[PDB]
Amino acid sequence: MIQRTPKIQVYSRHPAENGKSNFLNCYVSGFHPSDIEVDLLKNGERIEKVEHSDLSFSKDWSFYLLYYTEFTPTEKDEYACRVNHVTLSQPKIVKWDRDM
């Protein structure tokens, strides 16, 4: 059965400025099948007020979802996206870099 690994991007909606409200985004794309686990983490702890786009897919049938939550980035707060999928032997944690 076709199995495609998710692409992950963690990024802010607006350029991060310390003390200014923003959205933390985790975009997962190019994966098959649709069953997927995505959490956003703050200092390694899971954020609870997280929503996602309606399931959609590309021309090649691979699925894509945007997970997002209001946040205010600080100098020292660490944000990340934890993804698990039948294609991953272990969950994948991508760290948020404000310049990527």
Add this chain to the structure above:
Amino acid sequence: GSHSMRYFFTSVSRPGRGEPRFIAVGYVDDTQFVRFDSDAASQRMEPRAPWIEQEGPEYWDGETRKVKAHSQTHRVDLGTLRGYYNQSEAGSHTVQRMYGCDVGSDWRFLRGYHQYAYDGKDYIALKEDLRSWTAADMAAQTTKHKWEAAHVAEQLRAYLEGTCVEWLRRYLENGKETLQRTDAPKTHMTHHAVSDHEATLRCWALSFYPAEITLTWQRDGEDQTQDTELVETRPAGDGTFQKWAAVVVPSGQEQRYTCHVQHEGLPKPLTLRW
């Protein structure tokens, strides 16, 4: 310039855990406007764009009825394909369908689509000619035989060339402020040392609509496609899109590099330097 309307359907069997999960979404170009989820409370087709909310009860009742039909067809389809592929009654399978139309700049019909995948592989597809079917395997050849017997391609063609374009045009008018906007990208450039002897130039395009963009690095006007870090165009989640490209610049070669940005929203392409 050109525009498209697309409907995307996902049905996923959950054997022993009730009826399959069915999710539908509609887009004009890069903008979602409708959704349906078999699992949600409303059991309604629901708006996802401000400009479709004002469609009256007639519109919504009609979309709800149809999306419910599409849902029920996929339920049957999951059974058919199980049969066709001599597959266990237990086991989770994915049926996907997409259909829609492209209009040119003159908002005249340009292309129609109608295609399916089973478990993430092509099953059946309407050809560009809008009359013949591509059948992957012998299973699909059965679908194809049935649809050819029933002149399905002709009835579809009518929708693709009529309703599909009619209602795309209507939506582009009703959503003119959102759908007919070109938001040029907000661009900037960053510089970070990688070592004593080389640094990253990263060229940013942000807040642009639609998603279509060309973002390239040149060294002395020669393209660096092989040497450029280029991320998938990604949604900001406010209706706009983001992209960046990065190049590793050896010490004192910054002046050799130019970032070039191309977008419908730009009158003329940007050249950016550090």
Add this chain to the structure above:
Amino acid sequence: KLWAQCVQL
């Protein structure tokens, strides 16, 4: 607007 026809594989 969705296509009003029911279509099955």
